[PDB]
C-alpha cells in the first residue's frame, strides 16, 4: 500500500454519553481524536497490520466494502487466543477461538469462547463512513456517521457527530489492529484516539455543533 499524511481538520467528535443535553456547554474527559492531528492515508493496491493505540478513527470515503471485517486479535496464531470481529453484508461474528492466520491475513473467498454472533441490522443496509472504535473495560463501542461531501479531494472544513451502536464484552489484551481483504484502489484514513478534554456545544435540538480541544493552543485553554 501507499502511505501518506493528511491533516485531520477538526474531525472525529462523538457522543460521550447516552444523555440528552440541550442548549448547554458540557465539558468531558474521554478518549478523543485531537484537533489538527496527523492522521495517515492508505492507498491499498497490494499489507501488514497496524498498532491498536487505544482507539482507531476510520474515515473511508470511497464506495464499496472491500475494507470491511477489521479483526482485533492480539496474536493471530496458536497458543494465545485471537479475536475475530469480521463484518459482512450478511452477519457479524464475534469469536475468540485461537484460529490461525498468516503474517498478511486476508479473507480467502476462493476453542475457548466460540459463537456469540450478532445480526448487525443497521449495518446490514459521498459514502464517508466515519467510524470510531474503542475498547474501555473490555467493552466494544462503535460510533458511525454517514455525511455527504461536495468534492472527494480531502476531509472537508465542517463538523459531524457520531452516535454509539453496540456494546460487546471481550476483556483481553488487545495490542494491534488489522483490517481484512476479501480477495477472490482503496482510500481510507486512520486516526488514533488520545485522552483529551473537550468542550461540547449542544444546540437547542440536542446535537453537538461546535467543539473546542482544551489542550491545543492557549486560546482554547482560555475558552475552556
Amino acid at each position: 500500500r501507499t502511505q501518506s499524511y493528511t491533516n485531520s481538520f477538526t474531525r472525529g467528535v462523538y457522543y460521550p454519553d447516552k444523555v440528552f443535553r440541550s442548549s448547554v456547554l458540557h465539558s468531558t474527559h474521554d478518549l478523543f481524536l485531537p484537533f489538527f492531528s496527523n492522521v495517515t492515508w492508505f492507498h491499498a493496491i497490494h499489507n501488514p497490520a497496524l498498532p491498536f493505540n487505544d482507539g482507531v478513527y476510520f474515515a473511508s470515503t470511497e464506495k464499496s466494502n472491500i475494507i470491511r471485517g477489521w479483526i482485533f486479535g492480539t496474536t493471530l496464531d496458536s497458543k494465545t487466543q485471537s479475536l475475530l470481529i469480521v463484518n459482512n453484508a450478511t452477519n457479524v461474528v464475534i469469536k475468540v477461538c485461537e484460529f490461525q492466520f498468516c503474517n498478511d491475513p486476508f479473507l480467502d473467498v476462493y476453542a475457548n469462547n466460540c459463537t456469540f454472533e450478532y445480526v448487525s441490522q443497521p449495518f446490514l443496509m459521498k459514502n464517508l463512513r466515519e467510524f470510531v472504535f474503542k475498547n474501555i473495560d473490555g467493552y466494544f463501542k462503535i460510533y458511525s456517521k454517514h455525511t455527504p461531501i461536495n468534492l472527494e479531494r480531502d476531509l472537508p472544513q465542517g463538523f459531524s457527530a457520531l452516535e454509539p451502536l453496540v456494546d460487546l464484552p471481550i476483556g483481553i489484551n488487545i495490542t494491534r489492529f488489522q483490517t481484512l481483504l476479501a480477495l477472490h484502489a482503496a482510500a481510507y484514513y486512520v486516526g488514533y484516539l488520545q485522552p483529551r478534554t473537550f468542550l461540547l456545544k449542544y444546540n437547542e435540538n440536542g446535537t453537538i455543533t461546535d467543539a473546542v480541544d482544551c489542550a491545543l493552543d492557549p486560546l482554547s485553554e482560555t475558552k475552556c
Binding site: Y15, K18, F20, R21, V24, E163, P164, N205, G206
Partner: protein, 49 residues
C-alpha cells in the same frame, strides 16, 4: 417526585435519560413503551405572615 407529561424533546434512540445543571433527572423514557416523559416537581414556594 414530580409530574409526568408528554414533551417535544427530540430524543435520539440511544438516549433515555435527561440531565440538569445540578444533576437531576429532567426527562425519562418509559422502560415498557418507547415514549418520552418530562419530570417536573409540582407546586411549592415560600409563605409569609
Amino acid at each position: 417526585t414530580g409530574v409526568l407529561t408528554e414533551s417535544n424533546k427530540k430524543f435520539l434512540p440511544f438516549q433515555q435519560f435527561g440531565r440538569d445543571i445540578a444533576d437531576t433527572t429532567d426527562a425519562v423514557r418509559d422502560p415498557q413503551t418507547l415514549e418520552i416523559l418530562d419530570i417536573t416537581p409540582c407546586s411549592f414556594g415560600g409563605v409569609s405572615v
